[PDB]
């Protein structure tokens, strides 16, 4: 491992409650001149975007994952956790013309 | 809005170079770049590089850029906004680091600041 | 900008089209004579069609013209940013066929209750 | 409302037919193809003279439309009520046929003296 | 003033002339049935070309019409006494002849980057 964009290390939940992972770095690749995206990242299988542009949604994604990106760390919130939501969670930053720089990851369990 | 087929699970061992196939379908395969990202087993996931069927024009992470060989086809036009393409992924000086799931991704948009955002996911192919 | 021409961002963004509508705009408008007399006037038949809606919803004398009407969902329920940097023309004419007569009719009566408001505002 | 459709309120009050305009402004636009398409030019003539006449009044774009030429009694001396709220378009236009004239030049100069107006406004 | 009619001050100065524009606006729209049609049609042509002209310019309903355009001195180095008290309509067309299609694109694009202009203040 070698991500210089850390995350919350991992996080936990219960159903009807919301959950929040962070993810932040130093000056070279966040926050505030740069976009964040947020992947759901099942077990090295199909990936999902979630949120671009650090609080845009992707097509049809629920109305629970926000985004929100201070000048200095971008959070990902989950409201009302339903239960199809035990997965990895992965940030990206990144502009116009760049690459994606992702993120440590987090797992989040749901558990109740 | 389709799909992005593979290849298969091909093993080989050091030294050598593998080639892995992303068929496409359902969308007009120029209007979106290719990209290409891995998860292996010492690190998480690592953008690789994407590559625009339409402009040819390539740009991959400089931790890649002496290993990658990036190319892609010319869509047959299925109807006025269907078509099928194919972008292709190889590597030079192969290791077991690299031992990992391998899969394309076609991109988010068209235009703006978000144009290359690996959006569309293909299924994922397991080297060495 | 690039001098695409007539009909130049055909299959780009609807962004990307946006930019160039005066030049679709400008290029609007013996027996075989009448032929061509025939498509003389049909020519300008389908032309006053489209300022005679034009005039009637309050967008006489606009390429982009903004009104009231907002936004059904039913019509469509994307996102601006998957509309304006995504899709073409062609493209979002097919998805708003159905409901392309449905947003006429709003219009229409968007601008007879505006001028209505405005014929009471300057009543006093 | 009512959708009493084109002509619908022709024998109502010019109160009630004012509310529907846009239905009207709606459907107001071989040998035997040359009586057709004599129809079909006189069409657009006789639909272009209204907007000309409108072009040149500043209602441009306008089903109802203000402007500052006065009211004068010799046109007719009815109150406002016994107008909007007892007459048809039908009857005023018995009424007032012989000064419609008279007022269509009123319009003309008072949008040229507006414009004019207007002109040394936006020179400083 | 002096109703000098239909082209009345085609001899006047060019400000003589400005103040006389509804006269020149109001006058501007079986085998010889054909070539009657066809001086109809024409008519008609001819018309609403001067209209789409002033409509992609947002002119659309003036007889006099302000733009952004500034004037180049390229087009004519003359001053603005010697040219509304001097020249008339007749001789300022020779003098700008050529640069007649320079200043139709400017008005065109200087509308579209109007509208454009107006399209993002109205978002917010
Ligand atoms: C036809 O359809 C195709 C496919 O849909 C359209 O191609 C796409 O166009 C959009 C916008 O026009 C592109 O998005 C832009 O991407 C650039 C990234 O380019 C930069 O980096 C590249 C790699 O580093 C590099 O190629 C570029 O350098 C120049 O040189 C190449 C040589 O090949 C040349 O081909 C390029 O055109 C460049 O000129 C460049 O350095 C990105 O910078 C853009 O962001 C800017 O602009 C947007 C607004 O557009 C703005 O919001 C941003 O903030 C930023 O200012 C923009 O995202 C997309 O990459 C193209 N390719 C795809 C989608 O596959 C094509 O435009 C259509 N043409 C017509 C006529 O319809
Ligand atoms: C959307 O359109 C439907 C009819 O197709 C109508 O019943 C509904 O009220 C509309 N909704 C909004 C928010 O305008
Ligand atoms: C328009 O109506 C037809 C009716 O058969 C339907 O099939 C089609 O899906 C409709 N279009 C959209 C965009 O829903
Ligand atoms: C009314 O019209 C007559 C001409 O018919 C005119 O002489 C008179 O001045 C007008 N009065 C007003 C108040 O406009
Ligand atoms: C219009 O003029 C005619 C001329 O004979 C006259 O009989 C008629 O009464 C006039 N109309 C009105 C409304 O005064
Ligand atoms: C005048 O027009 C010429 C082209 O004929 C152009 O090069 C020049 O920049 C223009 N000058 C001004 C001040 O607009
Ligand atoms: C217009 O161009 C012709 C080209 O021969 C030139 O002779 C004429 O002087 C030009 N007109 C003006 C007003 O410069």
């Known amino acids: 491992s070698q991500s210089v964009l850390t995350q919350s290390a991992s996080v936990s939940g219960s159903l009807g409650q919301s959950v929040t992972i962070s993810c932040t770095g130093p000056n070279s690749v966040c926050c505030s001149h740069k976009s964040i995206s947020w992947y759901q990242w099942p077990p090295g299988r199909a990936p999902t975007l979630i949120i671009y542009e650090d609080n845009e949604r992707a097509p049809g994604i629920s109305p629970r994952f926000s985004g929100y990106k201070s000048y200095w760390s971008a959070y990902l919130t989950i409201s009302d956790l339903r239960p199809e939501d035990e997965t990895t969670y992965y940030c990206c930053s990144y502009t116009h013309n760049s690459g994606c720089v992702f993120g440590t990851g987090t797992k989040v369990s749901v558990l109740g | 809005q389709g799909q992005l087929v593979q290849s298969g699970a091909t093993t080989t061992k050091p030294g050598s170079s593998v080639k892995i196939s992303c068929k496409t379908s359902?969308?007009?395969?120029?209007?979106?770049?290719i990209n290409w990202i891995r998860q292996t087993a010492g690190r998480g996931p690592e953008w690789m590089g994407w590559?625009?069927?339409?402009?040819?024009?390539?740009?991959?992470?400089?931790?890649?850029?002496?290993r990658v060989n990036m190319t892609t086809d010319t869509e047959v036009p299925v109807t006025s906004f269907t078509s099928t393409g194919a972008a292709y992924m190889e590597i030079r000086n192969l290791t077991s680091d690299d031992t990992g799931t391998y899969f394309c991704?076609?991109?988010?948009?068209?235009?703006?600041?978000?144009?290359?955002?690996?959006?569309?996911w293909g299924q994922g192919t397991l080297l060495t | 900008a690039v001098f695409l021409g007539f009909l130049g961002a055909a299959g780009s963004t609807m962004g990307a089209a946006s930019m160039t509508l005066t030049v679709q705009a400008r290029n609007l408008l013996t027996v075989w004579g009448i032929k061509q007399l025939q498509a003389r006037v049909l020519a300008v038949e389908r032309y006053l069609r489209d300022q005679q809606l034009l005039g009637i919803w309050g967008c006489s004398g606009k390429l982009i013209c903004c009104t009231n009407v907002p936004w059904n969902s039913s019509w469509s329920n994307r996102n601006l940013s998957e509309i304006w940097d995504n899709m073409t023309w062609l493209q979002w004419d097919k998805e708003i066929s159905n409901y392309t007569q449905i947003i006429y009719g709003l219009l229409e009566e968007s601008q007879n209750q505006q001028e209505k408001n405005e014929q009471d505002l300057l009543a006093l | 409302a009512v959708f009493l459709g084109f002509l619908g309120a022709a024998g109502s009050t010019m109160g009630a037919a004012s509310m529907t305009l846009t239905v009207q402004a709606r459907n107001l636009l071989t040998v035997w193809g040359i009586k057709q398409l004599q129809a079909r030019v006189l069409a657009v003539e006789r639909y272009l003279r209204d907007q000309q006449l409108l072009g040149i009044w500043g209602c441009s774009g306008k089903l109802i439309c203000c402007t500052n030429v006065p009211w004068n009694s010799s046109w007719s001396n009815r109150n406002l009520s016994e107008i909007w709220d007892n007459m048809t378009w039908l009857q005023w236009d018995k009424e007032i046929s012989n000064y419609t004239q008279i007022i269509y030049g009123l319009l003309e100069e008072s949008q040229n003296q507006q414009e004019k107006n207007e002109q040394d406004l936006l020179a400083l | 003033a002096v109703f000098l009619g239909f082209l009345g001050a085609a001899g006047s100065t060019m400000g003589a002339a400005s103040m006389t524009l509804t006269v020149q606006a109001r006058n501007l729209l079986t085998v010889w049935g054909i070539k009657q049609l066809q001086a109809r049609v024409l008519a008609v042509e001819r018309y609403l070309r001067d209209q789409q002209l002033l409509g992609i310019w947002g002119c659309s309903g003036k007889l006099i019409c302000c733009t952004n355009v500034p004037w180049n001195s390229s087009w004519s180095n003359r001053n603005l006494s010697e040219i509304w008290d001097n020249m008339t309509w007749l001789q300022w067309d020779k003098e700008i002849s050529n640069y007649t299609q320079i200043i139709y694109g400017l008005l065109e694009e200087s509308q579209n980057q109007q509208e454009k202009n107006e399209q993002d203040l109205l978002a917010l």
């Open positions: 991704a076609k991109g988010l948009l068209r235009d703006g600041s978000s144009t290359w955002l690996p959006y569309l």
């Open positions: 590559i625009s069927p339409y402009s040819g024009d390539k740009n991959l992470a400089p931790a890649f850029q002496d």
């Open positions: 359902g969308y007009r395969f120029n209007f979106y770049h």
